Design a protein around this ligand. Structure first.
Ligand code: NAG
Ligand code: NAG
Ligand code: NAG
Lengths: 187, 83
């Protein structure tokens, strides 16, 4: 399952509390079932901590180290999931981003625009995650995987014309997550 | 100019011509999208006629209006993009 993280807490503390969320596997991806869910922790110190979430689809974690690696697996009666995604975050990396511009405009009641230009970087970048939230009401967190090859992408989802949704595009690093560019309303 | 999210007004100024003209022909295309050429027929009399379809304001578009005579075709009047 594609697992995504979110900050819910104060920033002054050296430690950080992180909440994970992932989409439960569907039938074809499950191969007739995916019953337990297992989380394996990892750090730059290489401290591995494996826990079994089970049917629950969210997990809360906290730690004081700058770097920590998460590799969420899935347990099946045949065995654990061989191939799973990854994400790593580092505080010095989290303070730098190379994205320059951001915009949003409803072309329809079911379509909105994302446009962005980026300053050149020095290391490699793999993908972007785009999450948007409504400013009038605090709705559920919604996002979807976006690759780095594409430069301009059509979001196609149901929308309320009177409601104005904030947008925040997050850059991703191999060992870090750069700080997002946050816009409160459509351009 | 884009009046709504899915339309652009087509306005122009027609220079006097010693030879007559019956109608015109409007084209619009995207340089970066490289989409297929679209065309609806426009008479020489109507000034503010326009066609509505789903566009993208950020993208770079290409409109061109040609004058058609009864004996020849005038050179294209090509605009870089909507202002
Ligand atoms: C994380 O998983 C992906 C795909 O399963 C793999 O390509 C990548 O090398 C892994 N990273 C680490 C640090 O294990
Ligand atoms: C809304 O407009 C967009 C413009 O491209 C189009 O792709 C989409 O199908 C339209 N949706 C409806 C429900 O008409
Ligand atoms: C937006 O386009 C025109 C403005 O030129 C307007 O008359 C029309 O009603 C609008 N379209 C929709 C689908 O509301």
């Amino acid at each position: 399952p594609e697992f995504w993280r979110i900050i819910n807490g104060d920033t002054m503390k050296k430690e950080k509390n992180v909440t994970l969320l992932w989409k439960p596997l569907m039938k074809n991806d499950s191969l007739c079932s995916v019953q337990r869910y297992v989380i394996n922790h990892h750090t730059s110190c290489n401290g591995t901590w494996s826990e079994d979430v089970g049917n629950h689809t969210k997990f809360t974690f906290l730690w004081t180290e700058q770097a920590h690696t998460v590799t969420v697996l899935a347990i099946n009666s045949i065995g654990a999931s061989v191939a799973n995604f990854n994400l790593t975050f580092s505080w010095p990396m989290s303070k730098v981003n190379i994205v320059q511009s951001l915009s949003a405009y409803p072309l329809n009641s079911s379509c909105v625009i994302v446009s962005w230009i980026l300053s050149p970087s020095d290391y490699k970048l793999m993908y972007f995650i785009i999450e948007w939230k409504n400013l009038n009401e605090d709705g559920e967190i919604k996002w979807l995987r976006i690759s780095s090859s594409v430069k301009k992408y059509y979001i196609h989802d149901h929308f309320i014309p009177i409601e104005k949704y904030q947008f925040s595009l997050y850059p991703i690093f191999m060992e870090g997550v750069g700080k997002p560019k946050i816009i409160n309303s459509f351009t």
